[PDB]
Design a protein around this ligand. Structure first.
Ligand SMILES: Nc1nc2c(ncn2[C@@H]2O[C@H](COP(=O)(O)OP(=O)(O)O)[C@@H](O)[C@H]2O)c(=O)[nH]1
Ligand SMILES: [Mg+2]
Length: 168
């Protein structure tokens, strides 16, 4: 069965950059901030080939369409920008919505602090991100879609492993 992943986060945090870094192993073109799209990708993970569909969301407004995306997704990447405190503050409210939609099942998610290459304009500490991940009961990663630092491929692979584990 295909693993269905959805990426959420405030506009501008780097959702589209992260997805394209995962799919193409580079980041060389800017991408329309308003475009929402789904990508299919096959990867060998551990022994086997796994098919995934990844939804790169654009508008973050709380709508019936957004609830549909949350019902569709099996695993979620919540992204913030380490240079932007406001984006970090949107993460827990997103989780609360997801919890309600996936009830009675547990939500499978990861927390990603992107733009780690901008350490000099950092507003959110690595420690704060770790503590928030603890509050979400999920794995935490800092990375840079721009530089590729942070092992973005392994981040997605590990979310696929978790989705599949929880399926039983
Ligand atoms: N310095 C830096 N800029 C980034 C990184 N990821 C994305 N960006 C930039 O941040 C802006 C928003 O990225 P985008 O992928 O469109 O964010 P989205 O709105 O969440 O899809 C663009 O100007 C990107 O070039 C990163 O890791 N480091
Ligand atoms: Mg985008």
């Amino acid at each position: 069965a295909e693993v269905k992943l959805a990426i959420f986060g405030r506009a501008g945090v780097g959702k589209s950059a992260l997805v394209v870094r995962f799919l193409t192993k580079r980041f060389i073109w800017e991408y329309d901030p308003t475009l929402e799209s789904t990508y299919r990708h096959q990867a060998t993970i551990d022994d086997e080939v796994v098919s995934m569909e990844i939804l790169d969301t654009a508008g973050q407004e709380d709508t019936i369409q957004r609830e549909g995306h949350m019902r569709w997704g099996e695993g979620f990447v919540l992204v913030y920008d380490i240079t932007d405190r406001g984006s970090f503050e949107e993460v827990l409210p997103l989780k609360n919505i997801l919890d309600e939609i996936k009830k009675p099942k547990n939500v499978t998610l990861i927390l990603v602090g992107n733009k780690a290459d901008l350490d000099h304009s950092r507003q959110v500490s690595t420690e704060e991100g770790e503590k928030l991940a603890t509050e979400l009961a999920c794995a935490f990663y800092e990375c840079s879609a721009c530089t590729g630092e942070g092992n973005i491929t392994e981040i997605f692979y590990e979310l696929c492993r978790e989705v599949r584990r929880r399926r039983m």
